[PDB]
From a paper:
In this study, we created 494 monoclonal antibodies from patients with COVID-19-convalescent, and identified antibodies that exhibited the comparable neutralizing ability to clinically used antibodies in the neutralization assay using pseudovirus and authentic virus including variants of concerns. To gain structural insights into antibodies and the SARS-CoV-2 spike, we performed cryo-electron microscopy (cryo-EM) analysis of complexes with the proline-substituted stable spike. Accordingly, we performed local refinement to improve the density for each Fab-RBD portion, which allows fine modeling of the variable domain of Fab bound to RBD. In this analysis, the Fab binding location to RBD is roughly classified into three locations.
Ab159, Ab326, Ab354, and Ab496 exhibited similar or better neutralizing ability against Wuhan pseudovirus than the therapeutic antibody. Hamsters were infected with the Wuhan strain on day 0 and were intraperitoneally treated with 50 mg/kg BW of an N297A-modified antibody (Ab326, Ab354, or Ab496) or control human IgG1 on day 1. We mixed equal amounts of Ab326, Ab354, and Ab496, and administrated a total of 20 mg/animal (5-7 mg/kg) the day after infection with a Wuhan strain. Indeed, the live virus in the control IgG1 group became less than detectable range by day 5-7; however, those in all of the animals treated with the mixture of the neutralizing antibodies became undetectable by day 3, earlier than the control group.
Residue numbers in the entry:
A (entry chain H): 1 to 124
B (entry chain A): 332 to 529
C (entry chain L): 1 to 113
Write the structure that this text describes.
């Protein structure tokens, strides 16, 4: 069976960078587009971006343009997402999801990760 | 003449190629002995079209072309003339008037990784079928639907290439297979490549 | 930024059927036939209830049924049972290679002993 494993929870000071990883196993890594989604505390889901683990192409929403960069590593079958210039309104849970269609992007997020909790605050 | 045709450079190379970018080598001005080929007891498929696979070392050919692939085992049958499928028409097309031999052997011990071998590719989407003996290495975005794809992939803009991703646990139908296609030409020009006679 | 509107909440006694509506601009729902519905539980990752507009992924029962008309999609759950307490979201393609989630509806089974 398939399995997506994300990085552990992270705490970062405001104005920093968070790199969250998603390792996939149990299926053809290249051939299913990956989607990155966010859920802030008590705010509902929010679609962030879309990355192709085969050709390395990606696209985001205008909201996150210029702040988020996604990368692939087919050697270890991993997908990395880097969010820079954080702000107090970014603490949330980030999910990496696998598309449903084969070699195409359609927005059917059948398989999901475990969710990485990222917290940004000025405290310790 | 005493040159020996360089079958070793193509039958024993470390990495052969990807299907969509198969490399072709021109064998000429040399002597080719086929005893090592048809009596290797290791080739799963040795299918010869237009020539008998036993007496091929006594008739002289004008030149030979050697083509290499690393494909999926169950797709080997698609490398025959006339046959059509996913790689027979988008990756490698053999003319219906073929006069060569297709050799194929399993190589899951060299072209597979426990994590996954995402290094062999094949073309998945194409506007039209390939012409016989044609290469297509362009990675232009396949424009499906009606809205033009201006060079950025996404919705209704697919990436033509896909990866086999071999693993050393799949069935025989999903394991790597190294394929060598030897195309001859029985032209009227004076032959220059053929096996030892006297 | 574009947003898909959903009712704040929905409810139903155990056994009957409930409906959830997802409304959007003609370029979001009416334009394309790609409107999936996800179910989200507390403490678990969201699960894909249905995709396309009406197709059901393997595993989900026949209770859930989706259908779209004009510029509004709808998900109907029949034989509502106590395990359906969750937040349901509608995800739709919005053009320019971007997908948008709805606001979500928290379904409540009403009658609890
Ligand atoms: C993420 O996807 C974005 C959306 O892509 C659209 O959807 C896909 C499915 C395709 O249909 C695609 O064709 C769509 O564009 C994508 O944004 C798009 O990026 C392309 C190229 O990067 C842009 O094409 C260029 O457009 C300009 C004019 O821009 C007009 O539109 C924008 C947005 O509405 C306005 O803000 C402007 O003021 C303009 O009104 C053209 O001038 C340009 O052509 C000229 O330049 C090229 C290259 O030098 C020459 O060959 C031509 O001859 C011209 O001289 C391009 O055609 C497209 O506008 C843009 N659209 C949007 C909505 O953003 C984004 O790039 C993707 N990001 C990735 C992959 O990282
Ligand atoms: C390519 O390699 C094969 C073996 O990998 C060569 O075939 C013979 O292999 C045995 C051992 O398996 C050796 O003892 C022989 O010396 C090899 N040669 C012959 C003629 O038997 C083969 O020769 C190599 N070259 C080609 C063109 O196939």
């Amino acid at each position: 069976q398939v399995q997506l494993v994300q990085s552990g929870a992270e705490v970062k000071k405001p104005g920093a960078s968070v790199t969250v990883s998603c390792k996939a196993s149990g299926f053809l890594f290249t051939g299913y587009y990956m989607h990155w989604v966010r859920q802030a505390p008590g705010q509902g889901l929010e679609w962030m971006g879309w990355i192709n683990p085969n050709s390395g192409a990606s696209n985001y929403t205008r909201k996150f343009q210029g702040r988020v960069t996604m990368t692939r590593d087919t050697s270890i079958s991993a997908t990395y997402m880097k969010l820079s210039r954080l702000t107090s309104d970014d603490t949330a849970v980030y999910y990496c999801a696998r598309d449903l269609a084969f070699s195409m992007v359609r927005g059917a997020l059948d398989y999901w990760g475990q969710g990485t909790l990222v917290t940004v605050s000025s405290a310790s | 003449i005493t040159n020996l045709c360089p079958f070793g450079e193509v039958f024993n190379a470390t990495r052969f190629a990807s299907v969509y970018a198969w490399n072709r080598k021109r064998i000429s001005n040399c002597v080719a002995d086929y005893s090592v080929l048809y009596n290797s007891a290791s080739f799963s498929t040795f299918k010869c079209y237009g020539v008998s696979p036993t007496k091929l070392n006594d008739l002289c050919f004008t030149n030979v072309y050697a083509d290499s692939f690393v494909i999926r085992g169950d797709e080997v049958r698609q490398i025959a003339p006339g046959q059509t499928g996913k790689i027979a028409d988008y990756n490698y097309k053999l003319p219906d008037d073929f006069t060569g031999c297709v050799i194929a052997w399993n190589s899951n011990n060299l072209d597979s990784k426990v994590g996954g071998n995402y290094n062999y590719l094949y073309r998945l989407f194409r506007k039209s079928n390939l012409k016989p003996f044609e290469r297509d290495i362009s990675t232009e975005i396949y424009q499906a639907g009606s809205t033009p794809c201006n060079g950025v992939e996404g919705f209704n803009c697919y990436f033509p290439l896909q990866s086999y991703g071999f693993q050393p646990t799949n069935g025989v139908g999903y394991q790597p297979y190294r394929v060598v296609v030897l195309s001859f030409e029985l032209l009227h020009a004076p032959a220059t490549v053929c096996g030892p006679k006297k | 930024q574009l947003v898909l509107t959903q009712p704040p909440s929905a409810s139903g006694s155990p056994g009957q059927s409930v409906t959830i509506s997802c409304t959007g601009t003609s370029s979001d729902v009416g334009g394309y036939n790609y409107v999936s519905w996800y179910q989200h539980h507390p403490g678990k990752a969201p699960k894909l209830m249905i995709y396309e507009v009406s197709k059901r992924p393997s595993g989900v029962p026949d209770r859930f049924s989706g259908s779209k008309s004009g510029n509004t999609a709808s998900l109907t759950v029949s034989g509502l049972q106590a395990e359906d307490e969750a937040d349901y979201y509608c995800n739709s393609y919005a053009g320019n290679n971007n997908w948008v989630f709805g606001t979500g509806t928290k379904v409540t089974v009403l009658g609890q002993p």
